[PDB]
């Protein structure tokens, strides 16, 4: 196993939100063989940002989920050349964007180049307005599709008021190395928390806990 049960993160992300550019770097441990992970992130520029941080926080590594036996692990089978993933994140109110990370390991540390961009956010919006509180826990649908690993999410945000602002992402998984097999459908639950945070998200801990299943209990 290329893959140690103690991994460190790095992880840096560019983005742009509406115009609005940003820079942010993480830090981070996990044990991929258990489903946990967590980091420290912090924006290096374009703070504060003017927009609800919740929506980047899935963008910040399928690798960091327990796999039972009976199905194939697609992720930690990438290593240790690694794999990429690119997302697009659909929300009720025509907000569009399109995530992508490419993953590599060098030693005891997973390296994340990401990506984020999204658009067409409406000012007058929760993500715009700073009114998300958390995702709720959700489950990944994995499948192939034209010989893609691809993961459907149908999820929401909870804002302040009791009100839900729905979720779909579609991401396409991709190892680098040619002939790792790809896995039967199944399902992965997803368990993404902030930790804690500073007065306008500058400094946060992020927490995601991960477990592989067949539907079954």
């Given at each position: 196993?290329?893959?140690?049960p103690?991994?460190k993160?790095?992880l840096?992300?560019?983005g ?7 820079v ?6 996990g ?23 919740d ?28 794999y ?17 990370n ?5 030693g005891d540390?997973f ?10 956010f409406?000012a ?15 489950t ?25 602002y ?8 991709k ?7 790809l ?7 997803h368990?993404?928390?902030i ?16 477990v592989?299943?067949?539907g079954l209990?």
């Amino acid at each position: 196993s290329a893959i140690k049960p103690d991994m460190k993160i790095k992880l840096r992300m560019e983005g742009n939100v509406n115009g609005h550019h940003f820079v942010i770097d993480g830090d981070g441990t996990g044990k991929p063989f258990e489903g946990k992970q967590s980091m420290d992130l912090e924006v290096k520029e374009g703070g504060p940002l003017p927009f609800a941080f919740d929506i980047l926080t899935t963008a910040f590594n399928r690798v960091f989920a327990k796999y039972p036996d009976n199905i194939q692990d697609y992720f930690k089978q990438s290593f240790p050349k690694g794999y990429s993933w690119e997302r697009s994140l659909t929300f009720e109110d025509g907000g569009i964007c399109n995530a992508r990370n490419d993953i590599t390991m060098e030693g005891d540390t997973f390296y994340n180049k990401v990506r984020f961009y999204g658009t067409n956010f409406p000012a007058n919006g929760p993500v715009m307005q700073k009114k998300t509180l958390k995702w709720e826990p959700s489950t990944e649908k994995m499948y192939v599709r034209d010989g893609v690993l691809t993961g459907d999410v149908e999820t929401a945000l909870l804002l302040e008021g009791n009100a839900h602002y729905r979720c779909d992402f579609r991401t396409t998984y991709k190892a680098k190395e040619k002939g790792v097999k790809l896995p039967g459908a199944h399902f992965v639950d997803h368990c993404i928390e902030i930790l804690s945070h500073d007065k306008d998200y500058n400094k946060v801990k992020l927490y995601e806990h991960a477990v592989a299943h067949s539907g079954l209990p």
